[model samples]
Target chain A: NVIQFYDIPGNATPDKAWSPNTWKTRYTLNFKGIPYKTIWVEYPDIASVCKEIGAEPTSIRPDGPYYTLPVIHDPSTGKTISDSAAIARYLDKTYPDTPVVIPPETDALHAAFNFAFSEAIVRALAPIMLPATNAQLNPRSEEFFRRTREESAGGVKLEDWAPPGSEKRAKAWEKIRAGFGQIAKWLSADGNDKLLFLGDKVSYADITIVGWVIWVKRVLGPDSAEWKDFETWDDGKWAKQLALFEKYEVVPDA
Target chain B: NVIQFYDIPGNATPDKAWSPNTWKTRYTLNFKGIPYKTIWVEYPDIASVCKEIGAEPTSIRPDGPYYTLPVIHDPSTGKTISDSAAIARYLDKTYPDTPVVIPPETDALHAAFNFAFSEAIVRALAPIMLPATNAQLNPRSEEFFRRTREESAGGVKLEDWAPPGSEKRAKAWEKIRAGFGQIAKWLSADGNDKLLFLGDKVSYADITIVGWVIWVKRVLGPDSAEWKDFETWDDGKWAKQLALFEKYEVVPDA
Candidate 1:
């Protein structure tokens, strides 16, 4: 039984590329050299699709996110895992030989940092990203995504989430950029002038964070304010930080 | 400039006490046993106080947590310092007899983690704590406090930010509580059940994070949902985490 990756259908491109959350799990699998087939599902079809595969949402958000994507089925063990964090932990446990994702003795700090840092990214970027993300939806998902999303997004229209030239949008973008600025400062502080977040060693937290950064870069692009703000932090150290994550890639030659 | 401390006067009670940010400075001064005179600064007076004393504000943002408190005037250097982080760093430089507060070698990890974790706490508990914190301000401060704070707090009204018995408030409180849930297990996962954060040594990171906990405990007492949510996490281990900080008292029974 091989590993099977179930993820939301890719939107930014007309392909099966995974969402950032799903990309997290994929990055772990790729980092571990675990080859898996990818299965994509529309947002509206996630519930039935997950049920058919015996996978359920892991409740990353309230109301359980009820039925979401990024479920993996392992026929060898007759088990299924869902949620990025849970799936990463499961992969490490089952494939103990190469658990670089949650390596022993370093799990706590990395995991703690991961949780807090991940939320910070969302807190800082959600308002800025939601509208753009919504724009990427396919016809199959547009209705379901818009209705569920706009309601969850303070009951406002998707277009109005963060309008162009809005101060709130720019401010939200700045907060995230400022966090990156601090991260750049922290990375080089201590006279180390180092590269990685944890000083020369990039662990799970760094991997996932860089993964988020990669997604932000991929989706927002350098031309956009969100990407530009993030790129210019700490005198371009923020841009340099992306190089550290080149160690692993979901696609060998994209 | 005789190391004059400009702290907001205490509320929910009264007298020469301070807010959480002020308590951070006080904690450092006490830890170093740096003899300093306290000069209380009110919300309305903060801008004037900062300007008149040549203590410049640390502009962390545009709209800002602007005109914040915890300013210190140092006579030795004849320099006036504002901002908690700057003041803490200054205290360390001016007085080397006690470097325990922001101890050496632990700077990078603690400071980086501190920035992210502090933001996480703010993200999770601000809605729950801000309104309550505002209600404690003196009448002179209340008007300015409401306008500035509520503006900074996403343009929501002070009273309406997270009203008592509201789902939004409870959910916000619960998000922070869950962070402690991870922390409990994270502490013991290094093959030994450690009590203090950073294991055996209580560093500046622990001190500052604990300061935020003290804020919640003081502002939202034991009976309030904000306090209760934090208190019961990990079967009360979170409460036990607070006891670790009692070793350094600013003013023996002040």
Candidate 2:
């Protein structure tokens, strides 16, 4: 069975990052000796594939709803699978020969870390990327942003979600910044124990964390020097992981 | 063997309607003669279950991201399975004697309809329900909403997705209103049509659509008249579906 990937790097613009996850998937396939073909699916062309696979294109948001690079067409069954996590699982199951992207030993911890990283990268960065200050002046805009923040912050407790900003809103930037600091420390110190999220070999967790890290560094301009102390130097984990990442030549754009 | 469902309705609020889809699953079990038990998962209590299932609490959103009740303990393997679609398929495959929710002939079509409905309901409604209006106010949201209106319009564009308070938006609303009118017409004219969406029998499509219809009515309010057609019809599809729903007896606020 041939694996077909629908790729849209630099989507509509020339500057869009070639999705790091796609690179990882390709790398994983090659490492496993699995044959695969990459299909370039531009922004405008996604609807057709979505329709062919009996998927509703309307559900996909224009602004990165779930997965940035929407991977479709699983080679085994030719079924469409969206989301990086889902696709990663499918790949691991499909090709058992190559070491599992997420070994079973620390799968749970990997999942937790992956979830945390996703939150930091996607949810937390919202304000930084799309500042709420733009909406502060206009009443309509203010109400709109207020509702937006409230909805985004829903279910997540204040302590667990973010810090209090003002009477009108919570200081999400600080919370998100702190979250980044935590991640920076983790990565700088002992975060790179294994080639992947778990210690030892590369697994799905590695791909996920690596993908997020690439995005964070690109967008947030690498962690501060203070963050470097958090890096653990055991077994040259950082250097090794970075080398593996580079060997794969997975270049994520800013 | 007992199937245990863990769920919370209405923003995970105790008073929010217990997911009708979960109720429908239980109904399917009853109809298929499969026995099952259900547990009302309080919003805050999901963490414990998540730990038991080895799933991170983040997997479940605080504001109630579960489409149906999370199936905690399946009799077949004693493992937990989440996602309504997955659980439904599992239950059907596990209990072949009672037959599955979708007939083989129309399963694909039923699935397509369900996907479309989900896109229209869940994904589309995210902007309104979730706190992401600033993002929604951008060109991306307009494009996303516009595309949804165009593809799912079944003909007429929705005014709400169009220019705010403009004739196009109003016209779109009129078209949507007219579409609901059509559904009402179908239900009122032929209440006994064995099949709800496609053929002659309740399938997964019917279950999902009926559940969403209820949710819209609940959220939009009964007096809005946008769904007056479904509300007014006597012994119509909505009425018949409601009767079936009563058998399931799962309300959002259950």
Candidate 3:
């Protein structure tokens, strides 16, 4: 009984999983050793696909109810879940024998961590990454991404948001570095040797981190200066932590 | 044998505890039902007193080592612990059976929470509270606080930092409200009914939160419009959370 995973398609051949939000659930499913099949859904079709599968709206935007990708249809239990955290929790509950994502008594704390991480790290990387990410999408997805992002950005085109080697882009890179530095400080609370956020164990927290790290690596390409500089950050801890999840960064050909 | 609690003295009579950093330890000791006697130290004397008790320096500054309060000298174990988080962990380890402040496998996460809390809430409250706090300090502390703060602020007088009813002060107040709103969103991950950060139980996380909430209440006085507006924020959750710790906000007349 394989679960149906919905993910946004990118332009990359072989492995098109470039979205950090979807990568979270991808890593989660891999971490739990669950059998799942990927269904590539583009930007505009996310709402229709989610509705067809009976998944709830993840959030409400200014216009109306918003639907997004990373919706899973678990055939074994006949359950459809929306939102990454909800999916992780649901999988952990359904597959009780597998490792827990949101451990007992840590639900709210984990939620807080995600909020903090998104504000400090994810949002900081957007100016640089969103433009780069738009370039990595298929033409159809690319047009949709640029139009929506530029509109919300108050009419600034995607390429002009930061621009290559501009001072604004330079400052954006510095913020991303500082954001990772802050994460390093937090992880140091466990000690210099502990690689994961929750000490030795792997959980949703580590997945959330590596998901973004991989996004930078993929969108900017493995050889880009941005990815190279990111590898040198935090005394090379960022690269070291990402290495721990290398095995789970798999793309099934099914 | 009781723990020797080092705290800074403010200008208030009877209950002079005002610093948020020390309040974490105060709440921890009270929560664990540990017997402790407060030894009041002034601002300029913190380093000397920490040295006299053999307490480790909390951090290093450009000038050199920096010593701070919330240092606990436990007579029973002959241990002198420094840093609020360190003191909480030490107390938990020493008095294993009392209660767990930093639970197993949560040391790093708790540290991140504090970092997030300070960045969003505590620092945002500083401009407005610093001036108010300076006014509420003893003459010696007031002089030291004003001089050091002014120096760091590039010679802006404490009174002029965020003078009451100014646009700058209003912006700071708005930031504090938004910070709490962000926190409320995190806590709502579990459900709206769960009050504490860690759901039903009290931990160092709760202590760190209440410490700051109490700081605003204490420094601004219960009758101030600032504290009154704070009570109404986050749908009264802040005030309600503070109420849960009312019994532990005790000042023993040792």
Tell me, by TM-score, which candidate is best.
3
Identify the runs in model 1 with alpha carbons over 4 angstroms from their true place: A1-4, A8-18, A32-56, A60-65, A72-80, A88-120, A123-195, A220-234, A252-254, B1-16, B28-56, B60-81, B87-205, B216-234, B252-254
**Quality of candidate 1 docking, DockQ:** 0.20
TM-score per candidate: 0.67, 0.35, 0.87
Where does the lowest 10-residue lDDT sum fall in candidate 1 chain B?
B102-111
- The residue pairs in collision within model 3 are none
Question: Which portions of model 2 miss their true places by more than 4 Å?
Answer: A1-254, B9-16, B20-24, B44-48, B54-69, B104-107, B123-195, B217-240, B243-245, B250-254
Report, for every candidate in turn, its global Cα lDDT versus the true structure. 0.68, 0.48, 0.85
Instruction: Kindly list the per-residue Cα lDDT of model 3 for residues A120-142, writing each as its tens digit.
Output: 89889899989888887878888
Candidate 2, residue B101: Cα displacement in angstroms equals 0.7
lDDT of 2 at B171: 63
Candidate ranking (TM-score, best to worst): 3, 1, 2
Q: Model 1 chain A: which ten-residue window has the lowest total lDDT?
A: A245-254
Clashes of 3: 0
Interface RMSD of 3: 1.9
- Backbone clashes, candidate 1: 0
Model 2 chain B is weakest, by summed lDDT over 10 consecutive residues, at: B127-136
Error of 3 at B53 (Å): 4.9
Name the best candidate (by DockQ): 3
> Interface root mean square deviation of every model, in Å?
4.1, 20.7, 1.9
Candidate 3, position A41, lDDT = 89
TM-score for chain A, prediction 1: 0.85
Higher-TM-score candidate of 2 and 3:
3
